[PDB]
Design a binder for this molecule. Structure first.
Ligand code: HEM
Ligand SMILES: Cc1cc(N)nc(-c2cc(CN(C)C)cc(F)c2F)c1
Ligand SMILES: C[C@H](O)[C@H](O)[C@H]1CNc2nc(N)[nH]c(=O)c2N1
Ligand SMILES: [Zn+2]
Length: 411
Protein backbone atom coordinates (compact mmCIF):
# COMPACT_ATOMS: atom_id res chain seq x y z
CA UNK A 1 0.00 0.00 0.00
CA UNK A 2 2.85 2.33 -1.03
CA UNK A 3 2.61 1.48 -4.69
CA UNK A 4 5.33 1.49 -7.34
CA UNK A 5 4.98 2.81 -10.89
CA UNK A 6 7.68 1.89 -13.39
CA UNK A 7 8.83 3.47 -16.60
CA UNK A 8 9.90 0.89 -19.19
CA UNK A 9 11.69 3.22 -21.60
CA UNK A 10 14.08 4.44 -18.86
CA UNK A 11 13.71 1.74 -16.13
CA UNK A 12 12.95 4.70 -13.81
CA UNK A 13 10.76 3.77 -10.83
CA UNK A 14 8.78 6.07 -8.55
CA UNK A 15 6.84 5.40 -5.35
CA UNK A 16 3.28 6.66 -4.98
CA UNK A 17 1.95 7.41 -1.51
CA UNK A 18 -0.29 10.28 -2.68
CA UNK A 19 -2.98 7.76 -3.68
CA UNK A 20 -3.64 7.18 0.04
CA UNK A 21 -5.18 10.68 0.21
CA UNK A 22 -7.60 9.61 -2.53
CA UNK A 23 -11.21 9.61 -1.44
CA UNK A 24 -13.48 9.29 -4.47
CA UNK A 25 -14.09 6.09 -6.42
CA UNK A 26 -12.74 5.14 -9.86
CA UNK A 27 -15.25 2.72 -11.39
CA UNK A 28 -12.80 -0.15 -11.06
CA UNK A 29 -13.29 -3.04 -8.65
CA UNK A 30 -10.92 -5.82 -7.66
CA UNK A 31 -12.41 -7.91 -10.49
CA UNK A 32 -12.98 -5.37 -13.29
CA UNK A 33 -11.06 -2.39 -14.64
CA UNK A 34 -12.92 0.48 -16.32
CA UNK A 35 -9.87 2.58 -17.24
CA UNK A 36 -11.24 3.04 -20.79
CA UNK A 37 -14.85 3.94 -19.99
CA UNK A 38 -15.17 7.62 -20.94
CA UNK A 39 -17.66 8.91 -18.35
CA UNK A 40 -17.65 6.43 -15.44
CA UNK A 41 -20.24 6.82 -12.68
CA UNK A 42 -28.29 19.01 -3.88
CA UNK A 43 -25.88 18.33 -0.98
CA UNK A 44 -26.54 18.60 2.76
CA UNK A 45 -24.65 20.19 5.64
CA UNK A 46 -23.60 16.92 7.27
CA UNK A 47 -21.64 15.94 4.18
CA UNK A 48 -20.43 19.51 3.76
CA UNK A 49 -18.12 19.95 6.75
CA UNK A 50 -15.61 17.06 6.38
CA UNK A 51 -15.07 18.37 2.85
CA UNK A 52 -14.49 21.91 4.14
CA UNK A 53 -12.23 20.59 6.93
CA UNK A 54 -10.26 18.30 4.59
CA UNK A 55 -9.76 21.12 2.06
CA UNK A 56 -8.95 23.73 4.72
CA UNK A 57 -6.40 21.35 6.25
CA UNK A 58 -4.36 20.92 3.09
CA UNK A 59 -4.62 24.60 2.13
CA UNK A 60 -3.06 25.70 5.41
CA UNK A 61 -0.60 22.83 5.15
CA UNK A 62 0.30 24.32 1.75
CA UNK A 63 1.13 27.79 3.12
CA UNK A 64 3.14 25.96 5.81
CA UNK A 65 0.81 27.04 8.63
CA UNK A 66 -0.91 23.69 9.19
CA UNK A 67 -3.14 23.60 12.25
CA UNK A 68 -2.01 26.97 13.59
CA UNK A 69 -4.40 29.45 15.19
CA UNK A 70 -5.11 31.10 11.83
CA UNK A 71 -6.16 27.65 10.57
CA UNK A 72 -8.29 26.62 13.55
CA UNK A 73 -10.18 29.93 13.50
CA UNK A 74 -10.85 29.44 9.78
CA UNK A 75 -12.07 25.91 10.54
CA UNK A 76 -14.29 27.31 13.30
CA UNK A 77 -15.41 30.12 11.00
CA UNK A 78 -16.48 27.78 8.17
CA UNK A 79 -18.19 25.35 10.56
CA UNK A 80 -20.37 28.15 11.94
CA UNK A 81 -21.19 29.41 8.43
CA UNK A 82 -22.24 25.86 7.46
CA UNK A 83 -24.40 25.91 10.58
CA UNK A 84 -25.73 29.37 9.68
CA UNK A 85 -26.29 29.02 5.91
CA UNK A 86 -25.87 25.24 5.46
CA UNK A 87 -23.08 26.28 3.05
CA UNK A 88 -20.07 28.60 3.07
CA UNK A 89 -17.92 30.93 0.99
CA UNK A 90 -14.29 30.55 0.00
CA UNK A 91 -11.58 33.10 0.67
CA UNK A 92 -10.01 34.64 -2.42
CA UNK A 93 -6.84 32.72 -1.53
CA UNK A 94 -8.74 29.47 -0.96
CA UNK A 95 -10.46 29.88 -4.35
CA UNK A 96 -7.12 30.26 -6.18
CA UNK A 97 -5.48 27.35 -4.34
CA UNK A 98 -8.57 25.16 -4.85
CA UNK A 99 -8.82 25.99 -8.54
CA UNK A 100 -5.11 25.41 -9.17
CA UNK A 101 -5.26 22.05 -7.40
CA UNK A 102 -8.30 20.94 -9.35
CA UNK A 103 -6.06 21.33 -12.39
CA UNK A 104 -3.07 19.76 -10.59
CA UNK A 105 -5.29 16.74 -9.94
CA UNK A 106 -6.85 16.55 -13.40
CA UNK A 107 -5.46 13.08 -14.08
CA UNK A 108 -6.42 13.16 -17.78
CA UNK A 109 -4.50 16.46 -18.30
CA UNK A 110 -1.08 16.18 -19.95
CA UNK A 111 -0.15 19.87 -19.61
CA UNK A 112 -0.24 19.92 -15.82
CA UNK A 113 3.43 20.89 -15.44
CA UNK A 114 1.93 24.42 -15.63
CA UNK A 115 -0.70 23.96 -12.91
CA UNK A 116 0.73 26.56 -10.51
CA UNK A 117 0.79 29.22 -13.28
CA UNK A 118 -2.97 29.67 -13.46
CA UNK A 119 -4.81 33.00 -13.49
CA UNK A 120 -7.98 32.71 -11.44
CA UNK A 121 -10.78 35.15 -12.28
CA UNK A 122 -13.27 35.46 -9.44
CA UNK A 123 -16.67 36.02 -11.03
CA UNK A 124 -18.61 35.02 -7.94
CA UNK A 125 -20.12 38.57 -7.81
CA UNK A 126 -21.83 37.83 -11.15
CA UNK A 127 -25.64 37.92 -11.31
CA UNK A 128 -26.73 38.06 -15.00
CA UNK A 129 -25.94 36.40 -18.30
CA UNK A 130 -24.71 39.80 -19.50
CA UNK A 131 -22.24 39.78 -16.64
CA UNK A 132 -21.24 36.26 -17.59
CA UNK A 133 -20.61 37.34 -21.18
CA UNK A 134 -18.53 40.22 -19.88
CA UNK A 135 -16.47 38.03 -17.54
CA UNK A 136 -15.90 35.45 -20.31
CA UNK A 137 -14.82 38.18 -22.73
CA UNK A 138 -12.18 39.42 -20.32
CA UNK A 139 -11.14 35.79 -19.81
CA UNK A 140 -10.79 35.20 -23.57
CA UNK A 141 -8.87 38.42 -24.16
CA UNK A 142 -6.63 37.88 -21.13
CA UNK A 143 -5.88 34.19 -21.74
CA UNK A 144 -5.21 34.88 -25.43
CA UNK A 145 -2.61 37.64 -24.78
CA UNK A 146 -2.07 38.36 -28.50
CA UNK A 147 -1.30 34.67 -29.06
CA UNK A 148 1.19 34.32 -26.17
CA UNK A 149 -1.56 32.32 -24.51
CA UNK A 150 -2.03 32.27 -20.75
CA UNK A 151 -3.75 29.75 -18.52
CA UNK A 152 -6.88 31.17 -16.89
CA UNK A 153 -10.11 30.18 -15.19
CA UNK A 154 -13.24 32.22 -14.52
CA UNK A 155 -15.30 30.98 -11.57
CA UNK A 156 -18.99 31.97 -11.51
CA UNK A 157 -21.12 31.66 -8.35
CA UNK A 158 -21.24 28.27 -6.69
CA UNK A 159 -24.33 26.12 -6.89
CA UNK A 160 -26.64 26.70 -3.91
CA UNK A 161 -30.07 25.10 -4.14
CA UNK A 162 -29.70 23.36 -7.50
CA UNK A 163 -32.44 25.28 -9.32
CA UNK A 164 -30.17 28.38 -9.41
CA UNK A 165 -27.12 27.21 -11.32
CA UNK A 166 -24.80 29.32 -13.39
CA UNK A 167 -24.09 27.31 -16.53
CA UNK A 168 -22.19 28.01 -19.71
CA UNK A 169 -24.17 25.85 -22.12
CA UNK A 170 -21.32 25.64 -24.65
CA UNK A 171 -18.89 22.78 -24.23
CA UNK A 172 -16.05 25.23 -25.01
CA UNK A 173 -16.14 29.04 -25.07
CA UNK A 174 -14.92 28.90 -28.68
CA UNK A 175 -16.22 26.14 -30.97
CA UNK A 176 -17.13 25.99 -34.65
CA UNK A 177 -20.72 25.39 -35.68
CA UNK A 178 -22.17 22.09 -36.81
CA UNK A 179 -24.75 22.07 -39.58
CA UNK A 180 -26.22 18.85 -40.85
CA UNK A 181 -27.29 19.01 -44.48
CA UNK A 182 -30.43 18.15 -46.47
CA UNK A 183 -28.38 15.44 -48.21
CA UNK A 184 -27.60 13.98 -44.77
CA UNK A 185 -23.94 14.98 -44.37
CA UNK A 186 -22.55 17.64 -42.01
CA UNK A 187 -20.99 21.07 -42.56
CA UNK A 188 -18.83 22.68 -39.89
CA UNK A 189 -18.28 20.51 -36.80
CA UNK A 190 -20.43 17.36 -36.34
CA UNK A 191 -19.65 17.42 -32.61
CA UNK A 192 -21.81 20.51 -32.04
CA UNK A 193 -24.76 19.81 -34.34
CA UNK A 194 -27.23 19.62 -31.47
CA UNK A 195 -25.72 22.65 -29.72
CA UNK A 196 -25.75 24.61 -32.98
CA UNK A 197 -29.45 23.71 -33.23
CA UNK A 198 -30.20 24.83 -29.67
CA UNK A 199 -28.63 28.21 -30.43
CA UNK A 200 -30.91 28.42 -33.46
CA UNK A 201 -33.97 27.47 -31.39
CA UNK A 202 -33.07 30.34 -29.03
CA UNK A 203 -32.64 32.66 -32.01
CA UNK A 204 -29.19 32.32 -33.53
CA UNK A 205 -28.77 33.35 -37.15
CA UNK A 206 -26.31 30.85 -38.52
CA UNK A 207 -23.84 31.84 -41.28
CA UNK A 208 -24.24 28.17 -42.28
CA UNK A 209 -20.64 27.63 -43.34
CA UNK A 210 -17.70 25.76 -41.83
CA UNK A 211 -15.58 27.57 -39.26
CA UNK A 212 -18.42 29.67 -37.87
CA UNK A 213 -17.67 30.61 -34.25
CA UNK A 214 -20.71 29.67 -32.21
CA UNK A 215 -22.34 32.21 -29.88
CA UNK A 216 -22.18 31.84 -26.12
CA UNK A 217 -25.25 30.35 -24.38
CA UNK A 218 -25.05 31.69 -20.82
CA UNK A 219 -27.48 30.68 -18.06
CA UNK A 220 -27.28 32.84 -14.91
CA UNK A 221 -28.82 31.99 -11.51
CA UNK A 222 -30.85 29.19 -13.04
CA UNK A 223 -32.51 31.56 -15.53
CA UNK A 224 -33.15 30.53 -19.13
CA UNK A 225 -29.88 31.12 -21.04
CA UNK A 226 -29.18 33.94 -23.47
CA UNK A 227 -27.12 34.27 -26.64
CA UNK A 228 -24.06 36.52 -26.93
CA UNK A 229 -21.54 36.92 -29.76
CA UNK A 230 -17.88 37.15 -28.68
CA UNK A 231 -16.45 40.16 -30.54
CA UNK A 232 -14.61 38.55 -33.46
CA UNK A 233 -11.49 40.57 -32.61
CA UNK A 234 -11.26 38.46 -29.44
CA UNK A 235 -11.52 35.10 -31.29
CA UNK A 236 -7.93 34.45 -32.34
CA UNK A 237 -7.74 32.03 -35.26
CA UNK A 238 -4.78 30.31 -36.98
CA UNK A 239 -5.00 29.47 -40.72
CA UNK A 240 -3.37 26.07 -41.32
CA UNK A 241 -0.61 25.96 -43.93
CA UNK A 242 1.92 23.29 -44.56
CA UNK A 243 5.64 24.13 -44.81
CA UNK A 244 5.73 22.22 -48.12
CA UNK A 245 2.40 21.50 -49.80
CA UNK A 246 0.86 24.71 -51.15
CA UNK A 247 -2.41 22.93 -51.86
CA UNK A 248 -2.62 22.91 -48.05
CA UNK A 249 -3.51 26.60 -48.30
CA UNK A 250 -6.39 25.60 -50.59
CA UNK A 251 -7.43 22.96 -48.05
CA UNK A 252 -8.84 26.08 -46.40
CA UNK A 253 -8.57 25.10 -42.75
CA UNK A 254 -8.13 27.09 -39.55
CA UNK A 255 -8.50 26.53 -35.85
CA UNK A 256 -9.07 28.81 -32.88
CA UNK A 257 -6.07 29.53 -30.70
CA UNK A 258 -7.90 29.18 -27.41
CA UNK A 259 -8.98 25.81 -25.98
CA UNK A 260 -11.30 26.73 -23.10
CA UNK A 261 -13.52 24.07 -21.56
CA UNK A 262 -16.74 25.55 -20.26
CA UNK A 263 -19.01 22.59 -19.46
CA UNK A 264 -17.27 20.95 -16.50
CA UNK A 265 -17.77 21.36 -12.77
CA UNK A 266 -15.12 22.65 -10.37
CA UNK A 267 -15.24 21.19 -6.85
CA UNK A 268 -13.55 22.99 -3.94
CA UNK A 269 -14.06 22.00 -0.30
CA UNK A 270 -17.44 20.51 -1.09
CA UNK A 271 -18.61 23.59 -3.00
CA UNK A 272 -19.85 23.04 -6.55
CA UNK A 273 -18.97 25.53 -9.28
CA UNK A 274 -21.15 24.64 -12.29
CA UNK A 275 -19.71 27.45 -14.46
CA UNK A 276 -15.92 27.58 -14.46
CA UNK A 277 -14.49 27.94 -18.01
CA UNK A 278 -10.73 27.24 -18.03
CA UNK A 279 -8.23 27.68 -20.82
CA UNK A 280 -4.69 26.82 -21.67
CA UNK A 281 -3.13 26.19 -25.05
CA UNK A 282 -3.38 23.33 -27.49
CA UNK A 283 -1.28 20.29 -27.88
CA UNK A 284 -1.19 19.89 -31.64
CA UNK A 285 -2.78 16.46 -31.68
CA UNK A 286 -6.20 17.51 -30.39
CA UNK A 287 -6.51 19.62 -33.54
CA UNK A 288 -4.51 17.74 -36.15
CA UNK A 289 -5.49 14.20 -35.08
CA UNK A 290 -8.79 14.34 -33.21
CA UNK A 291 -10.55 17.52 -34.41
CA UNK A 292 -9.49 17.15 -38.04
CA UNK A 293 -9.31 13.32 -38.38
CA UNK A 294 -11.85 11.79 -36.00
CA UNK A 295 -14.29 10.04 -38.30
CA UNK A 296 -17.29 11.80 -36.75
CA UNK A 297 -15.42 15.13 -36.56
CA UNK A 298 -13.95 17.02 -39.59
CA UNK A 299 -12.90 13.75 -41.23
CA UNK A 300 -10.26 15.28 -43.51
CA UNK A 301 -8.07 12.19 -44.02
CA UNK A 302 -10.07 11.62 -47.24
CA UNK A 303 -9.00 14.87 -48.89
CA UNK A 304 -5.49 15.21 -47.52
CA UNK A 305 -4.69 11.72 -48.81
CA UNK A 306 -6.10 12.77 -52.19
CA UNK A 307 -3.89 15.81 -52.79
CA UNK A 308 -0.83 13.78 -51.80
CA UNK A 309 -1.75 11.13 -54.41
CA UNK A 310 -1.69 8.06 -52.15
CA UNK A 311 -2.68 4.41 -52.49
CA UNK A 312 -6.23 4.78 -51.18
CA UNK A 313 -7.37 1.52 -52.81
CA UNK A 314 -5.91 -0.56 -49.98
CA UNK A 315 -5.96 -0.33 -46.21
CA UNK A 316 -2.39 -1.62 -45.69
CA UNK A 317 -0.86 1.26 -47.67
CA UNK A 318 -1.04 3.36 -44.44
CA UNK A 319 -2.28 6.29 -46.49
CA UNK A 320 -4.28 7.37 -43.43
CA UNK A 321 -1.18 7.40 -41.22
CA UNK A 322 0.86 9.30 -43.81
CA UNK A 323 -1.82 11.97 -44.24
CA UNK A 324 -2.09 12.29 -40.46
CA UNK A 325 1.60 13.09 -39.87
CA UNK A 326 1.52 15.89 -42.50
CA UNK A 327 -1.69 17.43 -41.13
CA UNK A 328 -0.03 17.65 -37.72
CA UNK A 329 3.24 19.17 -39.01
CA UNK A 330 0.99 21.80 -40.60
CA UNK A 331 -1.10 22.57 -37.51
CA UNK A 332 2.12 23.00 -35.53
CA UNK A 333 3.88 25.03 -38.23
CA UNK A 334 0.96 27.44 -38.72
CA UNK A 335 0.53 28.05 -34.99
CA UNK A 336 4.23 28.76 -34.46
CA UNK A 337 4.85 30.97 -37.49
CA UNK A 338 1.97 33.06 -36.04
CA UNK A 339 3.48 33.29 -32.51
CA UNK A 340 0.38 31.50 -31.16
CA UNK A 341 1.23 29.23 -28.22
CA UNK A 342 1.12 25.51 -29.05
CA UNK A 343 2.93 22.35 -27.93
CA UNK A 344 3.84 19.27 -29.97
CA UNK A 345 2.89 15.87 -28.56
CA UNK A 346 6.60 15.08 -27.98
CA UNK A 347 7.46 18.23 -26.01
CA UNK A 348 4.25 17.95 -23.99
CA UNK A 349 4.67 14.29 -23.06
CA UNK A 350 8.29 14.82 -22.02
CA UNK A 351 7.17 17.71 -19.82
CA UNK A 352 4.57 15.45 -18.25
CA UNK A 353 7.24 12.90 -17.31
CA UNK A 354 9.34 15.74 -15.89
CA UNK A 355 6.17 16.93 -14.10
CA UNK A 356 5.46 13.42 -12.84
CA UNK A 357 8.92 13.33 -11.23
CA UNK A 358 8.30 16.64 -9.47
CA UNK A 359 4.94 15.33 -8.22
CA UNK A 360 6.29 12.04 -6.83
CA UNK A 361 9.16 13.90 -5.12
CA UNK A 362 7.50 16.94 -3.54
CA UNK A 363 3.98 15.42 -3.31
CA UNK A 364 4.22 11.61 -3.18
CA UNK A 365 2.58 10.88 -6.52
CA UNK A 366 0.67 12.18 -9.53
CA UNK A 367 -2.71 10.78 -10.65
CA UNK A 368 -2.59 10.03 -14.32
CA UNK A 369 -4.93 8.48 -16.88
CA UNK A 370 -2.70 6.72 -19.39
CA UNK A 371 -5.67 6.25 -21.75
CA UNK A 372 -5.94 10.05 -21.94
CA UNK A 373 -2.29 11.05 -21.46
CA UNK A 374 -0.86 9.05 -24.38
CA UNK A 375 -1.25 11.27 -27.46
CA UNK A 376 -3.68 9.84 -30.04
CA UNK A 377 -0.93 9.39 -32.61
CA UNK A 378 2.58 7.93 -32.43
CA UNK A 379 1.81 6.49 -29.01
CA UNK A 380 4.99 4.58 -28.27
CA UNK A 381 7.45 7.11 -29.65
CA UNK A 382 6.34 9.47 -26.82
CA UNK A 383 7.75 8.79 -23.34
CA UNK A 384 4.34 8.59 -21.62
CA UNK A 385 3.41 5.43 -23.59
CA UNK A 386 6.18 3.63 -21.65
CA UNK A 387 5.26 5.17 -18.28
CA UNK A 388 3.08 3.27 -15.83
CA UNK A 389 0.57 5.61 -14.20
CA UNK A 390 -1.59 5.14 -11.11
CA UNK A 391 -4.99 6.78 -11.65
CA UNK A 392 -6.91 7.97 -8.60
CA UNK A 393 -9.35 10.74 -7.78
CA UNK A 394 -7.99 13.50 -5.57
CA UNK A 395 -9.83 16.71 -4.71
CA UNK A 396 -10.21 19.67 -5.46
CA UNK A 397 -11.17 18.39 -8.91
CA UNK A 398 -12.76 19.14 -12.25
CA UNK A 399 -15.81 16.94 -12.79
CA UNK A 400 -18.04 16.12 -15.71
CA UNK A 401 -21.61 17.27 -15.43
CA UNK A 402 -24.76 16.71 -17.48
CA UNK A 403 -25.60 19.10 -20.28
CA UNK A 404 -27.89 21.87 -18.96
CA UNK A 405 -30.57 21.31 -21.61
CA UNK A 406 -31.32 17.81 -20.29
CA UNK A 407 -31.58 19.19 -16.74
CA UNK A 408 -33.13 22.65 -17.09
CA UNK A 409 -36.62 23.12 -15.70
CA UNK A 410 -37.47 25.51 -18.52
CA UNK A 411 -40.14 28.15 -19.21
C1 HEM B 1 -1.75 25.02 -20.30
C2 HEM B 1 -1.70 24.10 -21.26
C3 HEM B 1 -2.61 22.84 -21.27
C4 HEM B 1 -2.36 21.79 -22.05
C5 HEM B 1 -1.17 21.63 -23.02
C6 HEM B 1 -3.39 20.80 -21.81
C7 HEM B 1 -3.50 19.56 -22.42
C8 HEM B 1 -4.61 18.75 -22.36
C9 HEM B 1 -5.03 17.75 -23.32
C10 HEM B 1 -4.27 17.40 -24.62
C11 HEM B 1 -6.16 17.20 -22.85
C12 HEM B 1 -6.99 16.11 -23.55
C13 HEM B 1 -8.11 16.89 -24.24
C14 HEM B 1 -8.86 15.92 -25.08
O1 HEM B 1 -8.21 15.02 -25.72
O2 HEM B 1 -10.11 16.06 -25.09
C15 HEM B 1 -6.52 17.85 -21.60
C16 HEM B 1 -7.60 17.60 -20.78
C17 HEM B 1 -7.96 18.29 -19.62
N1 HEM B 1 -7.23 19.27 -18.95
FE1 HEM B 1 -5.59 20.15 -19.71
N2 HEM B 1 -4.27 21.31 -20.87
C18 HEM B 1 -3.83 22.59 -20.50
C19 HEM B 1 -4.49 23.41 -19.58
C20 HEM B 1 -5.42 23.06 -18.62
C21 HEM B 1 -6.01 23.93 -17.59
C22 HEM B 1 -5.64 25.42 -17.49
C23 HEM B 1 -6.87 23.19 -16.85
C24 HEM B 1 -7.75 23.59 -15.64
C25 HEM B 1 -7.72 24.80 -15.07
C26 HEM B 1 -6.84 21.82 -17.38
C27 HEM B 1 -7.53 20.69 -16.96
C28 HEM B 1 -7.94 19.70 -17.84
C29 HEM B 1 -9.18 18.95 -17.82
C30 HEM B 1 -10.30 19.09 -16.78
C31 HEM B 1 -9.18 18.11 -18.87
C32 HEM B 1 -10.30 17.14 -19.29
C33 HEM B 1 -10.57 15.96 -18.39
C34 HEM B 1 -11.77 15.28 -19.01
O3 HEM B 1 -12.21 15.72 -20.11
O4 HEM B 1 -12.29 14.30 -18.38
N3 HEM B 1 -5.96 21.82 -18.44
N4 HEM B 1 -5.53 18.77 -21.33
C1 LIG C 1 -7.55 23.75 -21.01
C2 LIG C 1 -7.44 22.78 -22.16
C3 LIG C 1 -6.26 22.64 -22.87
C4 LIG C 1 -6.20 21.74 -23.93
N1 LIG C 1 -5.06 21.57 -24.64
N2 LIG C 1 -7.30 21.02 -24.27
C5 LIG C 1 -8.45 21.14 -23.57
C6 LIG C 1 -9.63 20.34 -23.98
C7 LIG C 1 -10.21 19.39 -23.14
C8 LIG C 1 -11.32 18.65 -23.55
C9 LIG C 1 -11.90 17.61 -22.58
N3 LIG C 1 -13.36 17.37 -22.47
C10 LIG C 1 -14.15 18.60 -22.23
C11 LIG C 1 -13.90 16.60 -23.62
C12 LIG C 1 -11.83 18.89 -24.83
C13 LIG C 1 -11.25 19.84 -25.67
F1 LIG C 1 -11.73 20.09 -26.90
C14 LIG C 1 -10.15 20.56 -25.24
F2 LIG C 1 -9.60 21.48 -26.05
C15 LIG C 1 -8.55 22.03 -22.51
C1 LIG D 1 -12.90 4.67 -25.64
C2 LIG D 1 -11.97 5.71 -25.00
O1 LIG D 1 -12.20 5.78 -23.58
C3 LIG D 1 -12.09 7.11 -25.65
O2 LIG D 1 -11.80 7.05 -27.05
C4 LIG D 1 -11.05 8.07 -25.07
C5 LIG D 1 -9.71 7.37 -25.16
N1 LIG D 1 -8.69 8.31 -24.72
C6 LIG D 1 -8.80 9.63 -24.97
N2 LIG D 1 -7.78 10.47 -24.70
C7 LIG D 1 -7.90 11.81 -24.94
N3 LIG D 1 -6.86 12.64 -24.65
N4 LIG D 1 -9.04 12.32 -25.48
C8 LIG D 1 -10.08 11.51 -25.77
O3 LIG D 1 -11.13 11.97 -26.25
C9 LIG D 1 -9.97 10.16 -25.51
N5 LIG D 1 -11.02 9.35 -25.78
ZN1 LIG E 1 -8.68 0.02 -13.65
Amino acid sequence: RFLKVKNWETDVVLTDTLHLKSTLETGCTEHICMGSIMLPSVATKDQLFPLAKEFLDQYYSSIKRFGSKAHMDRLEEVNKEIESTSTYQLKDTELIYGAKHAWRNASRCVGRIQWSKLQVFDARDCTTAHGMFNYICNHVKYATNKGNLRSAITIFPQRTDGKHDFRVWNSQLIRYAGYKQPDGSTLGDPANVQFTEICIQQGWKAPRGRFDVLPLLLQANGNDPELFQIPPELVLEVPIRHPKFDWFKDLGLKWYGLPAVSNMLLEIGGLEFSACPFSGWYMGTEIGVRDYCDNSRYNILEEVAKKMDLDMRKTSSLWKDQALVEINIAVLYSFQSDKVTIVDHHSATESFIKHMENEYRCRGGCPADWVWIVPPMSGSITPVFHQEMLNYRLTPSFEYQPDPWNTHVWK
